[PDB]
């Protein structure tokens, strides 16, 4: 049930703002950072929404005006799409799949340019959609630098130390239009996902649901993304999607969602909820040291096999036929 | 067409002595050792029957009486079976497949014991079948040692040198009853197969027919053997067996069949042809050094993947499910 905003400002959002899907879900726990149960969850690589870390406390005031004024003159990657779905793709892998035609294009622009584009669409009632996704770097301005420095490093550093994680590799700034969706995928890093403006519905699936989510081949540009179209699932090609079960939540300003490494996640900015802003914190996982093997370890194994085969055969397109040749009449 | 034996002794064998199968074949070339075409074939890892190497010239006089008298008091492995089919199995791998029940059993005995058993079966009109298969070693007697030393080492050593092969690992003595069959399999060594007494029909398939022959899993005791029952093929489990095409020949005393590493072979002692005797020469292949990859190289790759997965998962029985999980909805 949607939470009530302090001061009797009503419900933060309602059901009608959620897209509808074919699968059930259970709620991710929302807990205080001081609650031992939250620590148990993170330690165990299970998701949890933390309500009071103050992780990005100083960014809570951010909005397009403040960012345009302070974020510098660096370039920003902005994706453009004609659908609500922003399927991630790896440009470096495009050569090996000449027939893949991305539904979204990346354009580099200045922040003011991004803001202007958002304005032109609104005014012209256009259907175009934009999603800015850009790692925070040295070119940001003074005020932003001050804000960044005011993040709760004390808490997040203890988290990094307590779990044996590797280094912070980056913080991605995500600014999206209402209704935008990042389709289901898994990342190979641990993520603290800090919501700043607006509301995002996050649906997660554990690594042991690999069989139900059907990731693209490792050498395909959509490596790590699910092939299933959540809006129109093809149960013929992906029969086990009929067995998928999610853990869901809606995060708002101030909330931090722990998205554990290898966990699938589908993220959507609420319909009619305005622009969203998020900043993530990506950490390399702990080192690989016992049976029985964990689901995520098996996933690590499958990726490696695919990778080795691709190199050994000299053509990634030869990966499938060999695998098929290996199992038919033998293991299936 | 069956050859004519010197001195007008008639046909060496006839069609009625061949078992019947569902697939077609083409003849393997029979050539003189001095013929350049024979050298081209071996160089290219293609089968050839050499008619005049004199490779085991001194063994042409061997028969059960001479061997019983001269082969020593060492132990001999003898397989016993109630079917004509002597499917090879690796005893060391039996623990990992508790449910595999071999159709043949191995018994160690003295040569005279083997000969006696052959006699008791004949006399008692029994249906039992025996196949002796034993590596030649130090315990053989003086006369046999003399015979072995008289093999044409000059020719076979040049062959080993010309092809870059590794060392002679062994020579297997095979003594079989008429009608015995060794079902289709591939060996990881190069083989010069020297026929001594009786006639054997040898049907070979190139390594690129892997998809049609359906070898057992690498960790299964029948690793390297085809799962298809040539006498009653199940086209439902093994549909591509309907596309298999063999290279066949019948070898007799004095002939040497080159069976190239990784080539499938099915070997049968002619029906009503009496006992057969053969001695093989197994050499390690040349070293692994260019695209496009050869069929046998791909086979090498598949074995390795299976092997690595088995070790990595800690249970070979987990190999299939992981592979299946890797391809369904992804590569198939």
């Amino acid at each position: 049930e949607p939470r009530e905003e302090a001061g009797a400002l009503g419900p933060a959002w309602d059901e009608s703002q959620l897209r509808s899907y074919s699968f059930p879900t259970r709620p991710i726990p929302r807990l205080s950072q001081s609650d031992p149960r939250a620590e148990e969850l993170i330690e165990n690589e299970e998701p949890v929404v933390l309500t009071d870390t103050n992780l990005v406390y100083p960014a809570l005031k951010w909005d397009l005006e403040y960012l345009q004024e302070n974020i510098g003159n660096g370039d920003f990657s902005v994706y453009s799409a004609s659908t609500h779905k922003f399927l991630y793709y790896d440009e470096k892998k495009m050569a090996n799949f000449q027939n893949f035609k991305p539904r979204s294009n990346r354009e580099e622009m200045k922040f003011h340019e991004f803001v202007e584009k958002l304005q032109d669409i609104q005014q012209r009632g256009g259907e175009e959609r934009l999603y800015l996704q850009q790692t925070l770097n040295d070119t940001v301005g003074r005020k932003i630098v001050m804000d960044f420095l005011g993040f709760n490093w004390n808490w997040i550093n203890k988290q990094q130390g307590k779990r044996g994680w590797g280094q912070l590799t980056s913080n991605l700034l995500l600014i999206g239009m209402e209704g935008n969706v990042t389709p289901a995928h898994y990342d190979e890093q641990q993520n603290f996902f800090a919501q700043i403006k607006g509301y995002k519905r996050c649906i997660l699936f554990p690594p042991d649901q690999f069989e139900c989510l059907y990731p693209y081949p490792v050498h395909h540009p959509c490596d790590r993304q699910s092939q299933v179209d959540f809006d129109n699932p093809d149960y013929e090609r992906f029969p086990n999607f009929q067995n998928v079960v999610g853990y869901e939540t809606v995060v708002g300003p101030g909330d931090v969602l722990y998205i554990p490494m290898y966990w699938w996640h589908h993220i959507e900015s609420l319909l009619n909820g305005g622009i969203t802003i998020t900043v993530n914190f990506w950490y390399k996982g702990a080192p690989t040291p016992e049976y029985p093997l964990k689901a995520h370890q098996k996933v690590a194994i499958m990726r490696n096999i695919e990778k080795m085969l691709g190199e050994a055969l000299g053509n990634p397109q030869e990966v499938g036929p060999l695998l098929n040749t290996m199992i038919k009449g033998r293991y299936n | 067409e069956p050859r004519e034996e010197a001195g007008a002794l008639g046909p060496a064998w006839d069609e009625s002595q061949l078992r019947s199968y569902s697939f077609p074949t083409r003849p393997i070339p029979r050539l003189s050792q001095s013929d350049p075409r024979a050298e081209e074939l071996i160089e290219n890892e293609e089968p050839v029957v050499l008619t005049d190497t004199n490779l085991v010239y001194p063994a042409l006089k061997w028969d059960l009486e001479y061997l019983q008298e001269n082969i020593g008091n060492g132990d001999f492995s003898v397989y016993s079976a109630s079917t004509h089919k002597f499917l090879y199995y690796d005893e060391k791998k039996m623990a990992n497949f508790q449910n595999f029940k071999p159709r043949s059993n191995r018994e160690e005995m003295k040569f005279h014991e083997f000969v006696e058993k052959l006699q008791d079966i004949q006399q008692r009109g029994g249906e039992e079948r025996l196949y002796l298969q034993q590596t030649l070693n130090d315990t053989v007697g003086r006369k046999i040692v003399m015979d072995f030393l008289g093999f044409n080492w000059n020719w076979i050593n040049k062959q080993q040198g010309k092809r870059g092969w590794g060392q002679l690992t062994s020579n297997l003595l095979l003594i079989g009853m008429e009608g015995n069959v060794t079902p289709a399999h591939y060996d990881e060594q190069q083989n010069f197969f020297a026929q001594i007494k009786g006639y054997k029909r040898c049907i070979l398939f190139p390594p690129d027919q892997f998809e049609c022959l359906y070898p057992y899993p690498v960790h299964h005791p029948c690793d390297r053997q085809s799962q298809v029952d040539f006498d009653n093929p199940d086209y439902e489990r093994f549909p591509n067996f309907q596309n298999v095409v063999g290279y066949e020949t019948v070898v007799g005393p004095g002939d040497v069949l080159y069976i190239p590493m990784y080539w499938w072979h099915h070997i049968e002692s002619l029906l009503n042809g009496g006992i057969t005797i053969t001695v093989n020469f197994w050499y390690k292949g040349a070293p692994t050094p260019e695209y496009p990859l050869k069929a046998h190289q791909k086979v090498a790759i598949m074995r390795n993947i299976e092997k690595m997965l088995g070790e990595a998962l800690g249970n070979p029985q987990e190999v299939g499910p992981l592979l299946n999980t890797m391809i369904k909805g992804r590569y198939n």
Binding site: D138, W153, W282, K284, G285, L293, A300, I301 | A312
Partner: peptide, 22 residues
């Protein structure tokens, strides 16, 4: 085999380096 890389839905100063520099 059990070893893993660090790929995510973003291309490869930032992270730890950004922070320390600041």
């Amino acid at each position: 085999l059990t070893s893993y890389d660090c790929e995510v839905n973003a291309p490869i100063l930032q992270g730890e380096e950004l922070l320390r520099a600041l």
